[PDB]
Chain A
Amino acid sequence: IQKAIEENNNFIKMAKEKLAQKMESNKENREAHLAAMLERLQEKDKHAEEVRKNKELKEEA
């Protein structure tokens, strides 16, 4: 009976832990994919600033 208790408990434990590891790595992965997308969009915003600036300077002609 002690072995039965121990195996049910170990099963509960490893299931709790496996899901926790998976929920965490999914949260990190999804966040990194969103962060990468936003960083790329942000790099667009600088390039747009650099184009408007480049026009400030062709107007200084």
Chain B
Amino acid sequence: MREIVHIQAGQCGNQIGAKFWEVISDEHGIDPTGSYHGDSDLQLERINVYYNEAAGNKYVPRAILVDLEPGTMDSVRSGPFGQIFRPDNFVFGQSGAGNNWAKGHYTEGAELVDSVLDVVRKESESCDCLQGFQLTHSLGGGTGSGMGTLLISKIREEYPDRIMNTFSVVPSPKVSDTVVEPYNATLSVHQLVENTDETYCIDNEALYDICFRTLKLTTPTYGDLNHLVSATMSGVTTCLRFPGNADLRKLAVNMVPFPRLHFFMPGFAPLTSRGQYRALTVPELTQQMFDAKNMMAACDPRHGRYLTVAAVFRGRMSMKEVDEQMLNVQNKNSSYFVEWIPNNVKTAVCDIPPRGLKMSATFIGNSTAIQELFKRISEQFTAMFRRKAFLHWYTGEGMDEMEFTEAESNMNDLVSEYQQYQDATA
């Protein structure tokens, strides 16, 4: 039994976290009271990766819910699957973090972090063989970003030989709460570079463009963005949740050739709006999945090169046709795969589809084009930082300009490290 411990931090972290638990609960047949009512036992062979078993044939998510504010967690307990969650795993302050990384990481969040770690310990102790952790959070606020990355540092200290992966929502001015997000994101990214094994980069800019341009939603809401996030989260975790022999470490080994370059581009096909009679064809799943339009990180894959790629196809389909179409798409895009990692494109098929689609495919791309995302953040960061604009919110919590200068430099080293491998040849 290779259990995963899930942590959701802050507003974005808990909203997308709750959708995730809603979506996979339905996939495993667990109802809002934790009672199993499914029709296949494929649903229960790996149920324990994400769920604990409690007497009474109940299944309880191995999930810890964290915020510095109670608001968004009252709404979780309200929401459709709110009762599923273990009540002692709600860990909440009252102050809120004011979209301030310094409050989440250094002052308000430091006050609360030990309480969170007590619940993490008490979930890990009950794990036959802990596989690792996943965190859902945004990088643009204060709690998920600042206190989320503090948690990751503490978790590493206590579990240094355990996998730490994240679903990290990147800020965009197109979907923006405050002007200081580039500061919060830049500080968080350096933490992630050091202390996560895999970070799935969920770019709110891509989720907006997708909703606005392809789904023709003229006023996208957080709900529309999260419909895409939840589809992708169900997707990437499909092969951890159903039979097919790789734990998180084995996936990291074959996806991450250099330790700092572990920021992945997600993607999904078919792109859908909430509320699909035509099943897509294996050729259609494949080409959409590689097209910039389905990329949930606003990066152009044709502007860089793929170091590794993974794709998970869901539904009853031809593995022969999957192999053929995958090997196809690699030849019209053959220049965009590094030639010094042989066979760096890998595929899985799972015959259980997601709710509401008979054919679907999830994309996991480790592309050097991701540097466009970090350049974009870095440019917004510098635009304000060259005038020290809005810094007083941070110096007022004990931070120094130097920590911002280091975060900036660390960020630009990451961009240069990507550019190194995009020009590397055989």
Determine whether B393 belongs to the interface, using a CB cutoff of 8 Å to chain A. Answer: no
Determine whether B106 belongs to the interface, using a CB cutoff of 8 Å to chain A. Answer: yes
Interface string of A1-19 (1 = CB under 8 A from B): 1111101000000000000
Determine whether B396 belongs to the interface, using a CB cutoff of 8 Å to chain A. Answer: yes
A2 to B399, CA, bound (A): 10
Contacts of B398 in A (CB 8 A): 1-5, 7
| Interface size in chain A (residues, C-beta < 8 A) | 6
Give, as a whole number of angstroms, the nearest-CB distance from B267 to chain A.
41
- CB proximity to B under 8 Å, residues A1-44: 1-5, 7
Contacts of B107 in A (CB 8 A): 1, 4
Cβ-neighbour of B396 out of A1, A2, A4 (below 8 A): A4
A7 to B102, CA, bound (A): 15
Which residue numbers of B lie inside 8 Å of A, CB to CB? 106-107, 110, 396-398, 400
Contacts of B397 in A (CB 8 A): 4
Further contacts, 10 of them, CB under 8 A, given A1-B110, A4-B397: A1-B106, A1-B107, A3-B398, A3-B400, A4-B106, A4-B107, A4-B396, A4-B398, A5-B398, A7-B398
Contacts of B400 in A (CB 8 A): 3
Say whether chain B's binding surface is mostly helix, strand, loop, or mixed.
loop
Closest chain A residue to B111, Cβ basis:
A1
Contacts of B396 in A (CB 8 A): 4, 7
Give, as a whole number of angstroms, the nearest-CB distance from B316 to chain A.
56
Give, as a whole number of angstroms, the nearest-CB distance from A57 to chain B.
78
Give, as a whole number of angstroms, the nearest-CB distance from B101 to chain A.
14
Contacts of A4 in B (CB 8 A): 106-107, 396-398
A16 to B131, CA, bound (A): 56
Contacts of A7 in B (CB 8 A): 396, 398
Contacts of A3 in B (CB 8 A): 398, 400
Closest chain A residue to B395, Cβ basis:
A7
Give, as a whole number of angstroms, the nearest-CB distance from A1 to chain B.
6
The 10 closest A-B pairs by CB, nearest first: A4-B398, A3-B398, A4-B397, A1-B107, A1-B398, A1-B106, A4-B107, A1-B110, A2-B398, A4-B396
Contacts of A5 in B (CB 8 A): 398
A2 to B397, CA, bound (A): 10
A1 to B107, CA, bound (A): 6
A53 to B110, CA, bound (A): 85
Best-buried of A3, A4, A7 by chain B (most CB within 10 Å): A4
Closest chain A residue to B398, Cβ basis:
A4
> Would you give 10 A-B contacts (Cβ < 8 Å), ordered by A?
A1-B106, A1-B107, A1-B110, A2-B398, A3-B398, A3-B400, A4-B107, A4-B396, A4-B398, A5-B398
A2 to B398, CA, bound (A): 7
Give, as a whole number of angstroms, the nearest-CB distance from A58 to chain B.
79
Give, as a whole number of angstroms, the nearest-CB distance from B240 to chain A.
38
Closest chain A residue to B397, Cβ basis:
A4
A1 to B113, CA, bound (A): 14
Contacts of B106 in A (CB 8 A): 1, 4
A1 to B110, CA, bound (A): 9
A1 to B396, CA, bound (A): 10
Closest chain B residue to A2, Cβ basis:
B398
A2 to B396, CA, bound (A): 12
Closest chain B residue to A6, Cβ basis:
B398
Give, as a whole number of angstroms, the nearest-CB distance from A12 to chain B.
14
Contacts of B110 in A (CB 8 A): 1
A1 to B397, CA, bound (A): 7
A1 to B111, CA, bound (A): 10
Closest chain B residue to A4, Cβ basis:
B398
A3 to B395, CA, bound (A): 9
Give, as a whole number of angstroms, the nearest-CB distance from B257 to chain A.
38
Closest chain B residue to A8, Cβ basis:
B396
Closest chain A residue to B106, Cβ basis:
A1
A1 to B398, CA, bound (A): 6
A4 to B107, CA, bound (A): 8
A51 to B254, CA, bound (A): 114
Best-buried of A1, A2, A5 by chain B (most CB within 10 Å): A1
Best-buried of B107, B110, B397, B398 by chain A (most CB within 10 Å): B398
Give, as a whole number of angstroms, the nearest-CB distance from A7 to chain B.
7
A3 to B110, CA, bound (A): 14
Contacts of A1 in B (CB 8 A): 106-107, 110, 398
